[PDB]
Design goal:
The structure is cut from a larger assembly and holds chains A (about 150 residues) and B (about 50 residues). By secondary structure, chain A is mainly α. Chain A contains seven helices and four strands; from the N terminus they run E-E-H-H-H-H-H-H-H-E-E. The two termini of chain A are about 35 Å apart. Classes of the chains: A mainly alpha (about 150), B mainly beta (about 50). Chain B: This is Major capsid protein.
């Protein structure tokens, strides 16, 4: 997405290991296939209950003052920390046919089927997990491992 | 020991005067880099004349 806009993002971390990755160019074809797979699943999470959830943005930035567990969310690199500093949103009222329906419930289930699904949509599925039989908590790099399907 | 004609310089007091000593309470607490959700309500009260 940087290549469509005339720093930095290379370094990962896991188990304390520092490791970067080798890449030079990316073809403009498959990036559009990845990006169109994003933004369709991005849009399909936004439902009528989401704007009600957006009114709780002033609540979280007040709650991150009080508990460090809420401070474990924002990480200073999220948009929502700096978004809460400027925008004070408020709820729309009143919803059409609000007696018969549940807007907060419908926003979550549509969110769980598109955005929470998207970890499957870009890469392939995690078909396989690991079940050692003689119990080895760590399977070392360069060794075999027992293998059992994952649903 | 004060000279004679320098006494007449006191007329400048007719140009600038002041009134009473006023008590003060001043409260601004706690200064930045200290304000935490545990520590909001407590203040530092200081005084001056």
């Amino acid at each position: 997405i940087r290549d469509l806009n005339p720093p930095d993002l290379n370094v990962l971390y896991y188990n304390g290991s520092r490791l970067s990755l080798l890449a030079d160019v990316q073809q403009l074809g498959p990036v559009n296939a990845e990006l169109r797979s994003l933004v369709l699943n991005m849009v399909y999470s936004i439902t009528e209950g989401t704007t009600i959830i957006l009114t709780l943005i002033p609540r979280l930035f007040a709650l991150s003052a009080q508990d460090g567990y809420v401070n474990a969310l924002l990480q200073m690199q999220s948009v929502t920390r700096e978004a809460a500093q400027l925008i004070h949103p408020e709820a729309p009222a009143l919803m059409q046919d609000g007696e018969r329906r549940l807007p907060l419930y419908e926003a979550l289930v549509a969110w769980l089927t598109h955005a929470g699904q998207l970890g499957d949509t870009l890469a392939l599925a995690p078909v396989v997990r690991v079940c050692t039989f003689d119990g080895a908590a760590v399977v070392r790099s360069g060794d075999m491992a027992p293998v059992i399907r994952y649903p | 020991v004060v000279d004679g004609p320098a006494m007449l310089t006191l007329q400048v007091l007719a140009h600038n005067m002041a009134e009473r000593t006023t008590a003060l309470l001043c409260s601004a607490a706690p200064d930045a880099g200290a304000n935490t959700a545990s520590t909001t309500n407590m203040r530092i009260f200081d005084g001056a004349l």
